[PDB]
Design a protein around this ligand. Structure first.
Ligand code: NAG
Ligand code: NAG
Ligand code: NAG
Ligand code: NAG
Ligand code: NAG
Ligand code: ZN
Lengths: 205, 601
């Protein structure tokens, strides 16, 4: 006989192992729900250059349950991965992707020069105000730096979105890195995502 | 919207748009400097013109933000360097003519060869051989050939080009509000706007001529000692009262008296301070030369070399399949790309230049986090000194034992301290009068003090007086012996190497005080002190953001270069040379010439 599909495995393969990734200014957000998140496949990985988790322990994820789990993915430069953390500043954190100050979840990154060489990846260089936590600005409106209004890109009128140029001869800091931001939230509510050890815990109705 | 705030957004758009444009220009120049081809001189010029055209638009846009409104010196230093209409001041034809002159000069130097009249295909070029004759040969007439042929075949090609290169570079600097092209070069040491730490362009001329007067006594007693030991090598050739013939020194020009060590070592029976023969016995590959230099920087806590450095650098001579500019250069291509172009040999000199050019890269890697325009050394002397601070500690007998190049049971003696200090003076002291005279000539040529009909007359008049070196063959104004050096043909300042030398002994004092050293300044070492490297790194990471005057005070304690740490480094050799020169004449005569006739009429 065949063991039943009482619970399903979370689509971490569709997220981490995706063929293409989003730009930081337009980061892709995927909801994870009604599945068992096996973090052991993420642990058995040598390519992950970053694996930092906040509010929780990276060794206790397979034994925890959460009411709402999100998966955010984008491609950022190597020296900008540090900005994908609570309380950080910079062009990426201020104008592209800002983690909340009281952020519970994990931030995983790995080098992708083998796949994202060349590539169409953009970042926002200018913005009137700093991005609020988990906000997305996909606007293409010119940035008015001076007092003179902007009718076309010119002296004091800059186009907001600027392009990345990824080459193999670049340093590690300027090389492309794929970031996956797992965002966790636990409330006094039924659980939607659980670890393998807590598989029966509230994942069943 | 303050002018300062909208200028930071302008510099932000510049610092990000310039990263890839400068990178592709460096990717093209690297392929040419390693693969000299006409295909790669078009690709270099096409990428360089893209970068120069980009700089012209940014220079014009930067002029809209007045420097008086910005109160942030980091922004003002950025806007100032971006504003200056470097070559834009020249006409379209004059800018293309100067770039053709600048290119024709660089190629003639790296492609010029002297051919056999008997066999036209028998050619010898400076990097493969003419340099070897001038480094290892002991024949007066063979050395005279490589010396005269390089200046009568390549220098003569450079004479009418240099005359145009002077008037074009002088028209450029004057339209940029400089007195001449020498003043434009001297502006690298300029500091203005920081009270108590400023420095004028004319102060460099004063301080160099004030510090050089205090090196004249030590140079004299070394020049008299070298004259004597050169007479034993070249009998009936050098006068006991005259100047050294130019073709009998260490290299093609006399830049470094390093190669004269075998002819000059005081106690030649002791173990060799020159560890060239040990590197062959203990077979050492180019890789080990740079891997061992990596350990020196790792030891002081400075970073190890990038993976792309080992993958993308050219550390060995490629071969006959392609030509490359074999002069040791360090490349900060941008975007974290750090490379070294060196046609490394197994000599001890290449072992010490590997430290010099890795010190370039370690400096380049440190200020990488700074804005693009501030990604540069505080001055040219600071950049060339960083590698010399390391090679100063890497050439000591104590360090040479730890890498196994010396005997495990090696003993240090008063004798070994002398013959080591002499080899140091052959490279460090022997180069100062050559560097001061070469810059003083160019400075006077750019100023117009030396007329065109007297370029070669004053060049050898000054080399006899300041350097104490006489020409073996009389040279007319059809020659351009200055241009026979890479730096004079490839538009590079030379006063770097004078200030470099004085800085490296100021930095070594402070760096060896951070580390625990209770001994003399020579035989010092900082090869495991993570405290001395941090004191060095805290200036390496600053770049050109803070002035070199203040950057020097925060490390060595002085806001100006001091020659006293140098004179104190050679005090054992100076008092020793004065004893050995009791039987010899200390000084030289500007009238004796090897080509003079010994007869009356
Ligand atoms: C991604 O795919 C590779 C094979 O293509 C596999 O070894 C790896 O485990 C996968 N990663 C995840 C998180 O599924
Ligand atoms: C030299 O340049 C040619 C292009 O003309 C290229 O095909 C070749 O690989 C280059 N060789 C080296 C050693 O860079
Ligand atoms: C210069 O401006 C930058 C903002 O672009 C600021 O971070 C820095 O602190 C300023 N420097 C000084 C010395 O005020
Ligand atoms: C650049 O040139 C223009 C005229 O060609 C001049 O008005 C401006 O002051 C120059 N800027 C600098 C920094 O020399
Ligand atoms: C540095 O320490 C190592 C031991 O870790 C030693 O082998 C080496 O000789 C030391 N070098 C110096 C210059 O002290
Ligand atoms: Zn150098």
């Amino acid at each position: 006989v065949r063991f039943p599909n009482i619970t399903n495995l979370c689509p971490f393969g569709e997220v981490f192992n995706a063929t293409t990734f989003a730009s930081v200014y337009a980061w892709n957000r995927r909801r994870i729900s009604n599945c068992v998140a096996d973090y052991s496949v993420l642990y058995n990985t040598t390519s992950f250059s970053t694996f930092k988790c906040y509010g929780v322990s990276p060794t206790k994820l397979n034994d925890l349950c959460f009411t709402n789990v999100y998966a955010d993915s984008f491609v950022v430069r190597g020296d900008e991965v540090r900005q994908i953390a609570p309380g950080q500043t910079g062009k990426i954190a201020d104008y592209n992707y800002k983690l909340p100050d009281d952020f519970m979840g994990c931030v995983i990154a790995w080098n992708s020069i083998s796949l994202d060489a060349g590539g169409s990846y953009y970042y926002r260089l200018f913005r009137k105000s700093v991005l609020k936590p988990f906000e997305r600005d996909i606007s293409t409106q010119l940035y008015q730096a001076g007092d003179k209004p902007c009718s076309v890109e010119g002296p004091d009128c800059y186009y907001p979105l600027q392009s990345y140029y990824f080459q193999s001869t670049n340093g590690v800091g300027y090389q492309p890195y794929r970031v996956v931001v797992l965002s966790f939230e636990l409330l006094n509510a039924p659980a939607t995502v659980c670890g393998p050890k807590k598989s029966t815990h509230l994942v069943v109705n | 919207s303050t002018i300062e705030e909208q200028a930071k957004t302008f510099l932000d758009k510049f610092n990000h748009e310039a990263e890839d444009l400068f990178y592709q220009s460096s990717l093209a120049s690297w392929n040419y400097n390693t693969n000299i081809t006409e295909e790669n001189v078009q690709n270099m010029n096409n990428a360089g013109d893209k970068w120069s055209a980009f700089l012209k638009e940014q220079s014009t846009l930067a002029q809209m933000y007045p420097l008086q409104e910005i109160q942030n010196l980091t922004v003002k230093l950025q806007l100032q360097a971006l504003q200056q209409n470097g070559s834009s001041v020249l006409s379209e034809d004059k800018s293309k003519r100067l770039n053709t002159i600048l290119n024709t000069m660089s190629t003639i130097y790296s492609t010029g060869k002297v051919c056999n009249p008997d066999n036209p295909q028998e050619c010898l070029l400076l990097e493969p051989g003419l340099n070897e004759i001038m480094a290892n040969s002991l024949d007066y007439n063979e050395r005279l050939w490589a010396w005269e042929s390089w200046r009568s075949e390549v220098g003569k090609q450079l004479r009418p080009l240099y005359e145009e290169y002077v008037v074009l570079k002088n028209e450029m600097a004057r339209a940029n509000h400089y007195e001449d092209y020498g003043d434009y070069w001297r502006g690298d040491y300029e500091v203005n706007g920081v009270d108590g730490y400023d420095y004028s362009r004319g102060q460099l001329i004063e301080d160099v001529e004030h510090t050089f007067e205090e090196i004249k006594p030590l140079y004299e007693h070394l020049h008299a000692y070298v004259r004597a030991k050169l007479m034993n090598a070249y009998p009936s050739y050098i006068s006991p009262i005259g100047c050294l013939p130019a073709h009998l020194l260490g290299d093609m020009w006399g830049r470094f008296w390093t190669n004269l060590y075998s002819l000059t070592v005081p106690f030649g029976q002791k173990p060799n301070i020159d560890v060239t023969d040990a590197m062959v016995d203990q077979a050492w590959d180019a890789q080990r030369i740079f891997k061992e230099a990596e350990k020196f920087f790792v030891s002081v806590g400075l970073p190890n070399m990038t993976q792309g450095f080992w993958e993308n650098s050219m550390l060995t001579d490629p071969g006959n399949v392609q030509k490359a500019v074999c002069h040791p250069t360090a490349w900060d291509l941008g975007k974290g790309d750090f490379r070294i172009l060196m046609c490394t040999k197994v000599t001890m000199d290449d072992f010490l230049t590997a430290h010099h050019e890795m010190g370039h890269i370690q400096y380049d890697m440190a200020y990488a986090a700074q804005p693009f325009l501030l990604r540069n050394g505080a001055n040219e002397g600071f950049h060339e000194a960083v590698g010399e601070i390391m090679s100063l500690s890497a050439a000591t007998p104590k360090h040479l034992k730890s890498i196994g190049l010396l005997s495990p049971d090696f003993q240090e003696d008063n004798e070994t301290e002398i013959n080591f200090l002499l080899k140091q003076a052959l490279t460090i002291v022997g180069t100062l009068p050559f560097t001061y005279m070469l810059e003083k000539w160019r400075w006077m040529v750019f100023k117009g003090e030396i007329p065109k009909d007297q370029w070669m007359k004053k060049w050898w008049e000054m080399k006899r007086e300041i350097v104490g070196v006489v020409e073996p063959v009389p040279h007319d104004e059809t020659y351009c012996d200055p241009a026979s050096l890479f730096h004079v043909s490839n538009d590079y300042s030379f006063i770097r190497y004078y200030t470099r030398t004085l800085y490296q002994f100021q930095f070594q004092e402070a760096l060896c005080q951070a580390a625990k050293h209770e001994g003399p300044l020579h035989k010092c070492d900082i090869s495991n002190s993570t405290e001395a490297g941090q004191k060095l790194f805290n200036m390496l990471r600053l770049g050109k953001s803070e002035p070199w005057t203040l950057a020097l005070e925060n490390v060595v304690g002085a806001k100006n270069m001091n020659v006293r740490p140098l004179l104190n480094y050679f005090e054992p050799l100076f008092t020793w040379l004065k004893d050995q020169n009791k039987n010899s004449f200390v000084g030289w005569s500007t009238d004796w010439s090897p080509y003079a006739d010994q007869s009356i009429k």
